[PDB]
Design a protein around this ligand. Structure first.
Ligand SMILES: Nc1ncnc2c1ncn2[C@@H]1O[C@H](COP(=O)(O)OP(=O)(O)NP(=O)(O)O)[C@@H](O)[C@H]1O
Ligand SMILES: C[C@H]1c2c([nH]c3c(Cl)c(Cl)ccc23)CCN1C(=O)c1ncc(OCCO)cn1
Ligand SMILES: [Mn+2]
Ligand SMILES: [Mn+2]
Ligand SMILES: [Zn+2]
Length: 353
């Protein structure tokens, strides 16, 4: 089929994976070792996240995501202005305090400065730091002009998840209530992405991250524990996510001279995909033989999210990714129009010629 042919072209080369994995591990392990020499980052550890580690990276293994996590004992959180996702952290760490507030901006600034100085000492490999991207909690490196790596500082809390998550992670009918309880016993993370404050931002605030839980779900994604472990249980969940990501990426590439698509991200499709899995919890609703129908249902669900301007964060239901505070109505209408055209014409944006 056409979709199967697209999936074939999206597969990663084993040779590319081998080379990229070696490059990234070498650079990241070095930066970890050097950061641990600083008094403030002594206890840092690594957590691999995002599409490469979820086995849904497409085309080339040229973008990796990692968290450098730090456990801070006796952590106390205060929600910022009923935003549900953003928090003050109250508490060798004195350098980052603003009163009793542990400033996200201050910690990120030193983290970035250390990494920038350390990549300058790496002489056996071309490593540079990309310019700051507003709204990202990550420090982004480019290795050998080819491989991007996002390194996100994170504080780790082993306390119960914040109350704003109480009604999220609605996986009970799909992955089980037992699994939901087990996942909610794991730590959660705070990353230095700041809440909007008018036309500025609250530079002290941090944002909740559950990227490790997203990875565990994607890598253990069936109602059956043996989903995708044998030829009789090959579902099309990840294939549908890959196709949705490629659809969005290709449209963003086409309309790049346009502004209306700049705010859409693969996280929007990832979030919508998790909701589709919640609404279709049986592995038999994702049979490989039904790839075209499954993908079409993912597309129409995403269209409905755009039209209603509703895409709840999977962990924090009152955080609407498609709120008008984040994305203009006209931008959602513009993307709706382009996706409808693709659906109605059997996805010409997928064709090479
Ligand atoms: N807006 C967001 N809110 C919460 N978490 C986010 C957000 N954007 C990114 N993340 C997290 O950061 C990870 C890496 O982001 P990103 O590299 O943009 O996407 P990805 O999922 O790795 N897909 P790809 O486009 O293949 O890189 C995501 O998988 C999420 O876990
Ligand atoms: C660090 C992460 C990230 C963002 N927001 C976050 C929130 Cl809110 C939380 Cl909680 C945690 C992590 C993140 C945006 C930026 N991130 C990305 O990985 C990223 N990578 C590649 C992109 O483009 C590729 C095509 O050009 C765009 N983004
Ligand atoms: Mn990524
Ligand atoms: Mn990234
Ligand atoms: Zn499966």
């Amino acid at each position: 089929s056409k979709l199967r042919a697209v999936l074939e072209k999206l597969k990663l080369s084993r040779d590319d994976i081998s080379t990229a994995a070696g490059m990234v591990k070498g650079v990241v392990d070095h930066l970890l070792l050097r950061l641990k020499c600083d008094s403030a980052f002594r206890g840092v550890g690594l957590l691999n996240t995002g599409s490469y580690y979820e086995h849904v990276k497409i085309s080339a293994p040229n973008e990796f995501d990692v968290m450098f996590k730090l456990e801070v004992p006796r952590i106390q959180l205060e929600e910022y202005s009923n935003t549900r996702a953003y928090y003050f952290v109250k508490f060798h760490l004195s350098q980052f305090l603003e009163g009793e507030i542990l400033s996200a901006s201050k910690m990120l600034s030193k983290f970035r400065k250390i990494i920038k100085e350390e990549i300058n000492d790496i002489k056996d490999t071309d490593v540079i730091m990309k310019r700051k991207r507003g709204g990202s909690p990550a420090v982004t490196l480019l290795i050998s002009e080819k491989i991007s790596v996002d390194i996100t500082l994170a504080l780790e809390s082993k306390s119960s998840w914040p109350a704003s998550t109480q009604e999220g992670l609605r996986i009970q009918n799909w992955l089980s209530a037992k699994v939901r309880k087990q996942l909610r016993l794991k730590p959660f993370y705070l990353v230095p992405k700041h809440a909007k404050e008018g036309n500025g931002f609250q530079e002290e605030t941090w944002r909740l991250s559950f990227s490790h839980i997203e990875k565990e779900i994607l890598n253990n994604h069936g109602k059956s524990k043996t989903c995708c472990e044998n030829k009789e249980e090959k579902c099309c969940r990840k294939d549908c996510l890959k196709l949705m990501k490629y659809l969005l990426e290709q449209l963003k590439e086409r309309f790049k001279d346009e502004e209306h698509l700049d705010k859409f991200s693969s996280y929007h499709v990832k979030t919508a995909f998790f909701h589709v899995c919640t609404q279709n919890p049986q592995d038999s609703q994702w049979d490989r033989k039904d790839l075209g129908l499954c993908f079409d249902n993912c597309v129409t669900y995403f269209l409905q999210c755009l039209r209603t301007e509703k895409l709840e964060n999977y962990f924090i239901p009152e955080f609407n990714l498609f709120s008008s505070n984040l994305i203009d109505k006209r931008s959602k209408e513009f993307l709706t129009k382009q996706i409808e055209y693709e659906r109605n014409n059997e996805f010409p944006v997928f064709d090479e010629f």
